[PDB]
Amino acid sequence: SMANVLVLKSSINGETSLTNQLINEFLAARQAAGHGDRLIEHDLSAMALPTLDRPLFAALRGAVDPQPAIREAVALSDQLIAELKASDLLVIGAPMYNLNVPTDLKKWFDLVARARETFRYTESWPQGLVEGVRAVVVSSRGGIHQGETTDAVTPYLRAVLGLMGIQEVEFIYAEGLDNRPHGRDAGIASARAQIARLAVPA
Amino acid sequence: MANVLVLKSSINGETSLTNQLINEFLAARQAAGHGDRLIEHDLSAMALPTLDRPLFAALRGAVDPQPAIREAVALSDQLIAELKASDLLVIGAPMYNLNVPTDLKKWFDLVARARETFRYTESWPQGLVEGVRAVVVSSRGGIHQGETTDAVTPYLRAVLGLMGIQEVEFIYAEGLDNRPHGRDAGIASARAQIARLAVPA
Ligand SMILES: Cc1cc2nc3c(=O)[nH]c(=O)nc-3n(C[C@H](O)[C@H](O)[C@H](O)COP(=O)(O)O)c2cc1C
Ligand SMILES: Cc1cc2nc3c(=O)[nH]c(=O)nc-3n(C[C@H](O)[C@H](O)[C@H](O)COP(=O)(O)O)c2cc1C
Ligand SMILES: COc1cc(S(=O)(=O)O)c(C)cc1/N=N/c1c(O)ccc2cc(S(=O)(=O)O)ccc12
Ligand SMILES: COc1cc(S(=O)(=O)O)c(C)cc1/N=N/c1c(O)ccc2cc(S(=O)(=O)O)ccc12
């Protein structure tokens, strides 16, 4: 009855990382609420994920490319698509970096959002092929953006996950960390309160 | 006259529609009497490094004697000096999985820089790039104008505004993968946006 949780960490701050700190605190809170978790942990920061270019996009679509480096990336694309389809809970660390997600997290979506694999084109809108997967997004920010137009990370993550079928996303925000005194403490405290709510639905 | 910095980011190569419409936009400007000097960048081919811990530290001004790091520090210097000396920034940014192409985001990750293009002050960090507008070329396989699924638009407005580029125009080619003539109506629409936006010099 153990949950299958795929953990994607994309911060570059190493040990100092807050989205990764809040991911761990969120994981323990799930255990502290009676959940046995099976974790596949991917530090996207240190995996050197490949970038999507014209040759790689064709092998991901079908074309024969007997390049050792391109054959290896399609293998990585398949394993990542396999892990995501096999899990119950996708937990994404998405700190705001220059008003976008971190590049390595974007590279993951580039290798995981694939036609015939995670979605398929319908006469109307693409249909997702990932079934029964929840998404919880940790996202610490410098200033505060949730609600306003300058927040691009939030509507981005919703659209790209929904394209693949994950129409269940829940955000743990930690905005306002640039204000040295209260700002950091309040945003973290708000996230830790959001954590305690989200660590219950199992 | 106008100093233009054209940024191409599509991966389709010579079949790229954004690159075609970037050209169609620049020719229509010369038709309206605008003689541009161009710095041209196909970010697909320059293999821009990814933002990581040591590079960000070096880009922030820290002493980082690492060789490969120092080169990307120079790549940020040169990429910013072009932008600061420009009059018109033209961006090709088609929707790639509801974000922008990765090779574009890496340029922003190198051009959005503290004590260079933006400065933190009490309240919101203020911009440091003066005299620059922006025209974004963005084609999409589906209809995303005005919807929540469009993050390219609010991201580009936000990240260009962060460094001071406030006037940003958008040229859209929506629903290019429709059964009847979605590719046609989308391009013809963007061409109607070509003719309007090419005038203001
Ligand atoms: C490279 C970099 C870029 C950032 N860009 C933004 C930004 O555009 N807007 C913002 O509000 N905060 C920005 N921040 C602040 C982060 O959101 C904040 O540091 C957050 O805690 C990072 O979480 P992490 O340590 O898990 O990466 C940026 C931080 C870094 C390191
Ligand atoms: C890798 C890739 C991802 C794409 N993702 C989207 C998408 O998420 N939504 C959409 O409407 N169209 C998407 N498209 C279709 C493009 O928007 C369309 O093909 C556009 O005209 C590409 O222009 P370009 O040749 O300059 O790259 C995608 C195309 C590619 C190649
Ligand atoms: C582009 O960068 C930023 C953009 C904006 S905004 O667009 O106006 O919203 C804001 C409000 C802040 C930003 N600075 N971000 C950091 C950074 O660049 C480096 C180290 C940091 C260390 C910490 S901290 O954890 O040690 O406290 C916190 C933040 C940063
Ligand atoms: C996540 O990917 C997508 C999401 C959506 S969405 O859910 O509705 O937002 C849509 C509508 C299309 C998408 N991908 N489409 C292409 C693609 O994957 C590869 C090559 C293409 C070449 C051309 S073309 O210009 O040469 O005809 C056109 C489209 C593609």
Resolution, given in Å to one decimal, reads 2.7
Site to substitute for ligand 4 among B99, B147, B177, most atoms within 8 A of C-beta: B177
Cα–Cα dist A67/A82, whole Å: 23
**Residues of chain A with C-beta less than 8 angstroms from the C-beta of B120:** 178
CA A117 to chain centroid, in Å, comes to 18
Cβ–Cβ gap B103/A51 under 8 Å = yes
End-to-end CA distance of chain A: 11
Q: Which amino acids bring their CB within 6 angstroms of ligand 4?
A: A 113, 115, 125-126, 163; B 97, 141-142, 149, 176-177
**Ranges of H-type helices in chain B:** 17-31, 43-46, 53-59, 67-84, 102-111, 152-162, 182-197
Burial, B106: exposed, middle or buried (Cβ in 10 Å; 0-12, 13-18, 19+)? buried
Phi and psi torsions of B46, nearest 5°: -85, -10
**Which experiment gave this structure?**
X-ray
HEC sequence for B104-142: HHHHHHHHCCECCCEECCCCCCEECCCCCEEEEEEECCC
Token pair recorded at residue A149: 């137009």
Distance, in Å, from the CA atom of A120 to the CA atom of A83, rounded to the nearest integer, reads 19
Q: A38 and A6 in contact (C-beta within 8 Å)?
A: no
Rounded-to-integer distance, Cα B116 and Cα A105, Å = 26
Number of domains in chain B: 1
- CB distance B158–A150 less than 8 Å? yes
Q: Domain containing B98: what range?
A: 1-201
| d(C-alpha B10, C-alpha B161), whole Å | 22
Sign of the alpha-carbon torsion through A18, A19, A21, A22: positive
CA distance A77 to A61: 11
Cβ within 8 Å, pair A98-B151: no
**Quick one: which H or E segment has residue A184?**
helix A182-198
What residues flank ligand 2, with Cβ below 6 Å? A 57; B 10, 12, 16-19, 94-98, 139-142, 144, 176
Q: A56-93 burial by CB neighbour count: b if 16+ within 10 A, else e?
A: beebbeeeebeeeebeebbeebeebbebbbebebbbbb
